[PDB]
């Protein structure tokens, strides 16, 4: 005779997933859990953005021609480019990456004169590696000479107190001339000493003239150095030549986030997870796009794919 029967649904085409117990079981419906789709632009909508282009982050502090428009920038988001260069006259920074990490999160910088003042020397030393229109130099810095070639360089001391509420970024340079005879034409003769102290920091420098391969037509080099001067603390500079003096000190504006990217800015899309090939916009817990992404990101995983069941076992005829 007559009866009642209960059952459940199914579909002709299910999706298969993994369980604890079996690999490739078919369920009515599933959903992805690992993000594969990148947006090939830096989604920057709503955020104060500064794209350094040709200026190197560290050049932001010393001031080569590329960086003139960035000596006092302000940003929530900072973008470094492959093309960017920290330098016009050839040289390096010591602890350069520490510095970059500080500057990336500073929210930008605010300059202020050291108020150094000079007598018994030249101040205007320039070079054709640093061209504005004709020979020029690091905008934040002063190429300290002796009155004309090969005059003596008269022992100097200069000091700067940090009278502000926050710590200062103090910078300076050591010049290594192509020759010993060049060191001479510039800063006179004999070997040269350059010391630097605070309440916090003791260190010391001698120049090292000699041939390097030429870079923007130069066999010489500048070594750049820096330290963080605490509020109320004083830095002093004892020196006798070969020295590249800071004209201005720097202060950090607030807070930001630094990225390195190869793609275009786009104020039409928003996101907080960035990598050099773009922005990962997604709600998902995981991603397989780029393990070096920075920001607020889904966790990077190895798998291309991990399906989460969102329905029952699929049982057809």
């Amino acid at each position: 005779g007559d009866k009642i029967c209960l059952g459940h649904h199914a579909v002709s085409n299910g999706t298969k997933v993994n369980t604890l117990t079996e690999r490739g079981v078919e369920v009515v419906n599933a959903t992805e859990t690992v993000e594969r789709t990148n947006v090939p632009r830096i989604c920057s909508k709503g955020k104060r953005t500064v794209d350094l282009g040709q200026c190197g982050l560290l050049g932001t502090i010393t001031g080569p021609p590329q960086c003139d428009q960035f000596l006092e920038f302000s940003a929530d988001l900072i973008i470094e480019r492959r093309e960017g260069s920290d330098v016009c006259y050839p040289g390096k920074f010591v602890n350069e990456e520490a510095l970059r990490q500080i500057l990336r999160e500073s929210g930008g910088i605010d300059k202020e004169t050291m108020g150094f003042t000079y007598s018994g020397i030249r101040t205007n030393g320039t070079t054709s590696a640093c061209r504005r229109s004709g020979s020029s130099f690091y905008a934040e810095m002063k190429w300290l000479l002796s009155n004309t070639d090969n005059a003596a360089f008269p022992q100097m001391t200069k000091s700067y107190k940090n009278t502000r509420k926050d710590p200062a970024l103090i910078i300076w340079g050591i010049h290594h001339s192509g020759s010993t005879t060049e060191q001479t034409k510039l800063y006179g003769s004999g070997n040269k000493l350059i010391t630097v102290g605070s309440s916090n920091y003791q260190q010391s420098f001698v120049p090292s003239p000699g041939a390097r391969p030429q870079v923007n037509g130069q066999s010489g080099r500048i070594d750049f150095h820096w330290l963080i001067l605490n509020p109320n603390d004083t830095v002093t500079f004892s020196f006798n030549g070969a020295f590249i003096a800071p004209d201005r000190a720097s202060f950090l504006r607030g807070k930001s986030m630094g990225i390195q990217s190869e793609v275009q800015v786009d104020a039409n899309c928003e996101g907080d997870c960035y990598h050099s090939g773009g922005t990962i916009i997604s709600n998902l817990p995981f991603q397989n796009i780029n393990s070096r992404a920075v920001g607020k990101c889904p966790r990077y995983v190895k798998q291309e794919s991990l399906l989460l069941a969102t329905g029952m076992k699929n049982v057809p005829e």
């Binding site: 005779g1 007559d2 009866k3 009642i4 029967c5 209960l6 059952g7 459940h8 649904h9 199914a10 579909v11 002709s12 993994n18 369980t19 604890l20 117990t21 079981v25 369920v27 959903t31 859990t33 690992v34 470094e80 492959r82 960017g84 990456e97 970059r100 990490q101 990336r104 999160e105 986030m257 630094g258 990225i259 390195q260 050099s276 709600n283 817990p285 995981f286 393990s291 070096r292 920075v294 920001g295 607020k296 990101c297 889904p298 966790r299 995983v301 190895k302 798998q303 991990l306 399906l307 989460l308 069941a309 969102t310 329905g311 029952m312 076992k313 699929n314 049982v315 057809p316 005829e317």
Partner: protein, 169 residues
């Protein structure tokens, strides 16, 4: 697997049923028919979306660069950084594959479970006026018309109103 119904004593599912997850098929005098149970269906769905909301969320944890794609950091620290980053990749891939397998076992089992619960409640509505077929069917030992059928479906069905009659057969 676990509760023994879906892919168990029920043979297979119903492509026919496009209206919910669980349903009734009846067979009486006036023909055949089917319909979806909302309460059980809703309970499965509500539970699954529970899972989903728990996994699609928001780290508020910022990280920054410790590393440099354009000018490599120094090798020693470079290799300590890469080794650390690779260890965390090992940890998160393991977590991810495990989470998904675990959740999938449970999803499947709670769906099986919800079907079994629906069966149970009906067996119990029909105390004595029916027998378990064994393939998920209830053989009704009286005549029960479309209207009576819907009384089971919508859980307002008096059993002792066919008791004398059905016990007889």
């Amino acid at each position: 697997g676990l509760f023994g119904a879906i892919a168990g004593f029920i043979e297979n599912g119903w492509e026919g049923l496009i209206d919910g997850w669980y349903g009734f098929r009846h067979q009486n005098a006036q023909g055949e028919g089917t319909a979806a149970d909302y309460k059980s269906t809703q309970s499965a769905i509500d539970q699954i979306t529970g899972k989903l909301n728990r996994l699609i969320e928001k780290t508020n944890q910022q990280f920054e660069l410790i590393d440099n794609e354009f000018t490599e950091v120094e090798r020693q620290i470079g290799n300590v950084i890469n080794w650390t980053r690779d260890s965390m990749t090992e940890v998160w891939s393991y977590n991810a594959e495990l989470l998904v397998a675990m959740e999938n076992q449970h999803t499947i089992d709670l769906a099986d479970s919800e079907m079994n619960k629906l069966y149970e409640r009906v067996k119990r509505q029909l105390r004595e006026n029916a027998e378990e077929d064994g393939t998920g069917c209830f053989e009704i030992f009286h005549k029960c018309d479309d209207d009576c059928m819907a009384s089971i479906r919508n859980n307002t069905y008096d059993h002792s109103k066919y008791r004398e009659e059905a016990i007889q057969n």
